[PDB]
Write a protein that binds this ligand. Structure first.
Ligand SMILES: *[C@@H]1O[C@H](CO)[C@@H](O[C@@H]2O[C@H](CO)[C@@H](O)[C@H](O)[C@H]2NC(C)=O)[C@H](O)[C@H]1NC(C)=O
Lengths: 50, 50
């Protein structure tokens, strides 16, 4: 029995994900962030984007 | 052939003298505040100091 899980990463909205639990957000501070599996480090600030 | 009248002319000579004093931080451009990438970069040595 064989199953092939085919996907494509970090290019569109994510609806399936791994089991890691979310946390609260901290603004105006440089933090190690992870959004939908996209990790990074930086300061998160409010913005307006359509 | 002898001149009898003359003129006083004004000409403009433009010369660049300087440029924009650019400066570059390797770590931001290459890695972007990521410590692991900087650690891998340290293996390259003194490229960036150069
Ligand atoms: C020598 O040449 C200059 C021009 O290069 C003459 O100056 C002009 O002369 C005419 C006629 O007298 C005037 O209408 C102009 O107004 C003069 N030019 C300026 C800028 O004022 C000058 O008169 C000439 N001199 C001789 C002895 O021929």
């Amino acid at each position: 029995r064989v199953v092939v899980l085919s996907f494509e990463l970090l290019h569109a909205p994510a609806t399936v994900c791994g089991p890691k639990k979310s946390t609260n957000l901290v603004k105006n501070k440089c933090v190690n962030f992870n959004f939908n599996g996209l990790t990074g480090t930086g300061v998160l600030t409010e913005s307006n984007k359509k | 052939a002898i001149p009898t009248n003359f003129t006083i002319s004004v000409t403009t000579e433009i010369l660049p003298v300087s440029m924009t004093k650019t400066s570059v931080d390797c770590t931001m451009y290459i890695c972007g505040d990521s410590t692991e990438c900087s650690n891998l970069l340290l293996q390259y040595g003194s490229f960036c100091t150069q």
